[PDB]
Amino acid sequence: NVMVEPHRHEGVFICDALVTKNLVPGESVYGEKRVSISEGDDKIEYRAWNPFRSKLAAAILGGVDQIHIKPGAKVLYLGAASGTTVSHVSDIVGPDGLVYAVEFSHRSGRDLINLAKKRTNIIPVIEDARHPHKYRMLIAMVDVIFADVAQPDQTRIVALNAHTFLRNGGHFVISIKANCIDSTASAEAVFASEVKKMQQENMKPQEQLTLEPYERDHAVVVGVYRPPP
C-alpha cells in the first residue's frame, strides 16, 4: 500500500494531509508532524503542511491550478517571516533549487537564519523589500516571486522586485489579505484593484482564488511576468 501519493504539483504530496518531502530528515521547523516511511534500505520522510498557517498550503488544497514553485526552481520569497512557508518551499525546490527569504524583521530574521543553517538552498536576506537596490547584488535572476508582505503598497513592492529579478516569462504568486491593503474597502474591491495594478506592471494574472475555510477575505493570485523590451 502506497501511503503518501504525489500531488498534481511536483514536489508536493498527500498523506487528507498535505505534505512535502523533508529536506532535513529528523527535524521539525514549527512543531509540525513528520512521517517517515521505511522499506528495506530505502527511507523517505515527509512534513505536514498546515493550511491554517500557510497561505500556499491553503491555496493548494483549494484547487489552485499552478504554483510554479517546483523542483529546481529559483524562488524570491518576499515576506518570509520566521520561515514556516519558506521551509516547505525549500522542500519543494530541493537541493538544486534556491529560495531567497526576504524579511525585514530582525526577530523573525533570526529564525530564518537558524532555519537556513540546515538548508543549503535558503538564503536569508534581512532587508526591506521596498528597497531592492540594497540587496540586488545578492539575488541571481529567479524563476518565481512569492509575496506575502501584507502592506498597502505590496503590488508596487512586488513589481519593483519583478523588474529587478524576475525572468521574462517567470511567474508570481501573491497572497493578499484584503484588510491589510485597505480595511474600508470590500475584499472584492481590494482584489480587483490589486489585479488591475498588477496588469499595469506587466504582471498578468492567470488565476485567482480565496482561501476559505482557512482564512477570511484572503486571496492568492498567480500569473506570468511579460515585461516589454
Ligand SMILES: Nc1cc(C(F)(F)F)ncn1
Ligand atoms: N514582512 C516584510 C515586509 C517588508 C516591507 F514591507 F517592509 F517591505 N519587507 C520584508 N518583510
